[PDB]
Nucleic acid binder design. Structure first.
Ligand code: ZN
Ligand code: ZN
Ligand code: ZN
Ligand code: ZN
Ligand code: ZN
Length: 143
DNA sequence: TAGCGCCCCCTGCTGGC
DNA sequence: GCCAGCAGGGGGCGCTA
């Protein structure tokens, strides 16, 4: 911990990533700003990734189908559809999932007590997931 | 420094069951 | 409906040409 942060218990080996840390967490200085919206980042790379949402530029092409992503890590995640990998394991029932959010959702829906459920206003049926309420609304009533 | 890399976060849909 | 699969837009770190 050579360059200790004067505001918290964290410390960094180079002064550069201390400046970036003090930006992300303490000073929130975002000098790299998008010229098409109010988005700004502590990092230029985050800015450029953001820019590709405006242009539709998908530079990272999947080699097994027509899919292509705006961020390298989204491609990596998409490849799990062709590979069937399931990197995340629930530490309670040990079921496996292709994404971390899916696991968190599983832990919330299967292993958390007294979870607030969603209710359909039109047929008085309890639904566990916000998105399943949306589908229920679209398929059943009128939506 | 900008540029890779990591991984997480969160959000919201599909379609088999 | 439940469920996991699956894609889009983001944050924060560790590292370094
Ligand atoms: Zn700090
Ligand atoms: Zn923008
Ligand atoms: Zn693909
Ligand atoms: Zn589980
Ligand atoms: Zn209903």
């Amino acid at each position: 911990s050579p360059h200790k942060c004067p505001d918290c218990d964290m410390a960094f080996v180079t002064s550069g990533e201390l400046v970036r840390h003090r930006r992300y967490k303490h000073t929130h200085e975002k000098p790299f700003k998008c010229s098409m919206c109010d988005y700004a980042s502590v990092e230029v790379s985050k800015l450029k990734r953001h820019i590709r949402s405006h242009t539709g530029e998908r530079p990272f092409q999947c080699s097994l189908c027509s899919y292509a992503s705006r961020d390298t890590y989204k491609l990596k995640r998409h490849m799990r559809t062709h590979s069937g990998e399931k990197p995340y394991e629930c530490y309670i029932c040990h079921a496996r999932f292709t994404q971390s959010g899916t696991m968190k959702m599983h832990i919330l829906q299967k292993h958390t007590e007294n979870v607030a459920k969603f209710h359909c206003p039109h047929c008085d049926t309890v639904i566990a997931r916000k998105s399943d309420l949306g589908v229920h609304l679209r398929k059943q009533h009128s939506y």
